[PDB]
Ligand binder design. Structure first.
Ligand SMILES: Cc1ccc(-c2ccc3c(ccc4sc5c(c43)NC[C@@H](C)NC5=O)n2)cn1
Ligand SMILES: Cc1ccc(-c2ccc3c(ccc4sc5c(c43)NC[C@@H](C)NC5=O)n2)cn1
Ligand SMILES: Cc1ccc(-c2ccc3c(ccc4sc5c(c43)NC[C@@H](C)NC5=O)n2)cn1
Lengths: 282, 282, 282
């Protein structure tokens, strides 16, 4: 009737006893890249983030540990601190995830488009994800559609949030709201296929912005506030129907996917100007 | 010809592999309560203090470890840092102790009263206890007759000091003296059955304060000084006869026990105003 | 095709399970002495440095770990943090080394003297040693001919650098140059058999300072600069011929060894005034 999960554990034996390291690259995210790695015993393939090892990261990971305990958050599995070059390293090993940057995955649906109801599902989940962190006092601070990846390529295959190179524990407008901001950011693009455009006004083109419930077009408002305050807290955010919906959302045809195919070329812009938009945002 | 004891060790595997946790409560002291807990292998019952886990506690315990190495100080046995709620916990497991808040144990002697010579024994011991901590540079800072408990209910069964939620290492009037103060505090009540009463003068009623060696009534003085300086250091405190006595102290009948029975009702006052008196005292 | 070494590991089980401790003293260096110690399993003899255990040391060692990964640097093998007296100790165990304070070892060659070419070898090596530390951003800060010891007494038997009670990681004239300074210091004495003498001018007596390539007498210059800047960095220092030489250096007879025999008595002065000279030097 009473339970916990294990504490975080820094193994010190050269991961090389415990795994076999490829060089086959994966993510080339923040600090160090991401390497295919296979667990010797099990023989399963794995993400490996390489870290300099300094209190910062050393905590950043420290939180991740707690966070992984989440469904929609990427789970860490083992965290060795060894010695690569000549400097006390830090290798955090986590479930690899081959589903792809959420969006990039949708724009190859081809057969059948996307649905406002299916768009929910995505956003819907993302919500939960954020909650947890906040709901324990962590703010992610970088919620890019780069860092929303899927597990497998099987269509049921769920998606998760990663790269804790940014987050903080919300201790003692605030912090845990950029995370909101982004969700907002996310939804927009999730429907048309672009964000706003400042560094202002965000317009609503015909062929996509239509009978598409102005009701939804409401929420997004409270979400997007260039304000810090009044940007609808996640705690808040969850409550609203569309979120807790699953099934009553408009069956609308979503151009979103193909919207992107239409001018796939301007995204390295989008995808990235977002980090610009983000990160720097305090 | 050369020796040590082991270092402190933070196990990280969910204590749930290593113990079976009840919910049967015990102490409801400082932070977290105290739970009956049984060691799987041995199958012995145990105290478990639950801690938030922040440098403070995380050190407070850290000292306790060293301290336990003492007879009259409660011994820690294992200290897991896991994850309860959503926050890196800290579970320190120690020998449970069912003898009771020193005093509360005496006021049920009934058959035969207490003896100035037997009162020594108690105080006598408590002294040692303090020494150690100080004698390694730790000040306890909370020495309540709540935190002086006995092991078993068998009359030989000794007593020990606990709850390190307060102490410090005396590094670099001072600090390690409140601990004195309290011993003082303790002895008084240990004889009549009350403390002073300020927030001043401490009087000496007939039916108890009597042929009871004014000699003892001396020491207590040097102990009680509302001063910081000149409150007889423990190092000092030990030297005096009555302490190193065991056997020459007056065989006096002590009302103390029954003294308390006489107005048991005002104690929640006593017992507690002491923490008030204490703690806050710097 | 990809590799590391293991991370540093603080064992906590009383070393007394893992080794048998003598009392036979060895080094009486910085903090704690040096004890013969034998590894239970292997049954090999070992150095043991005893440390108070405070962040400082606790890091000082922490670096040593990385450093040991070096040939010419003394290797640490195990680092227990236990409880001696009453205070969280720290016992770092390393390969013992019975070859002797570099110099002291040379002044008993007797049969055949020393060679400028053989003097290189020594200095030559020492160079490398320093490089590493610096080459990973550690400055040793104490490079005395006390801390340059040999492994065995067999003449091939190499020598290594020890006592990290002083060093720092060179993070963010500078720091990692005292180490240079000393090398300089070392070479001089390595040839005549004294240093300079200030607290100034360093002269060059006949019977030793002779056809002995003024070319070498050059380098030493750039090394010795009472300056902080322009004291030839090690990175630099290495490049020059004499260093990378091994074999083209003058076959000169070196009085050095016997030079010391000649007035062995003034050395406790030399050997030590060096620490004076050193250490304090910022
Ligand atoms: C077949 C196959 C197997 C695994 C993967 C894969 C790629 C990148 C990551 C990953 C898991 C976690 C994290 S975290 C993280 C990552 C990744 N990559 C860069 C960015 C998003 N930031 C990060 O820190 N698994 C892809 N394909
Ligand atoms: C049958 C049975 C078994 C065990 C106990 C028992 C109760 C309370 C504590 C204890 C041991 C240590 C500590 S420490 C501590 C405690 C206790 N309780 C609250 C206060 C004094 N502060 C503290 O931190 N063992 C009582 N009865
Ligand atoms: C037969 C035999 C066996 C071993 C040794 C031996 C003596 C001193 C040290 C040593 C290894 C490391 C270190 S480090 C260190 C040391 C020593 N000694 C004092 C000074 C140099 N400072 C230090 O910290 N091995 C000598 N002879």
């Amino acid at each position: 009737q009473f339970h916990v999960k294990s504490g975080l554990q820094i193994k010190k034996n050269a991961i090389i006893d415990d795994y076999k390291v490829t060089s086959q690259v994966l993510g080339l995210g923040i600090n160090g890249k991401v390497l295919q790695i296979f667990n010797k015993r099990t023989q399963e393939k794995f993400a490996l983030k390489m870290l300099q090892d300094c209190p910062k990261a050393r905590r950043e990971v420290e939180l991740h540990w707690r966070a992984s305990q989440c469904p929609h958050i990427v789970r860490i599995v083992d965290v060795y601190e060894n010695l690569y070059a000549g400097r006390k390293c830090l290798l955090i090993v986590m479930e690899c995830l081959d589903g792809g940057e959420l969006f990039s995955r949708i724009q190859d649906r081809g057969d059948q488009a996307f649905t406002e109801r299916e768009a929910s599902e995505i956003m819907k989940s993302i919500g939960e994800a954020i909650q947890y962190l906040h709901s324990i006092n962590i703010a992610h601070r970088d919620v890019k559609p780069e860092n929303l990846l899927y597990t497998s390529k099987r269509p049921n295959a769920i998606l998760k949030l990663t790269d804790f190179g940014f987050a903080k524990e919300t201790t003692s407008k605030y912090d845990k709201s950029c995370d909101m901001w982004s969700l907002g950011v996310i939804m927009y693009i999730l429907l048309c296929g672009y964000p706003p455009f400042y560094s202002g006004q965000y317009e609503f083109p015909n062929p996509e912005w239509s009978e598409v419930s102005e009701e939804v077009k409401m929420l997004i408002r409270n979400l997007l506030k260039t304000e810090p305050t009044q940007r609808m807290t996640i705690t808040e955010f969850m409550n609203h129907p569309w979120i807790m919906q699953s099934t009553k959302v408009p069956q609308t045809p979503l151009h979103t996917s193909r919207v992107l195919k239409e001018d796939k070329e301007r995204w390295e812009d989008v995808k990235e100007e977002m980090t610009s938009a983000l990160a720097t945002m305090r």
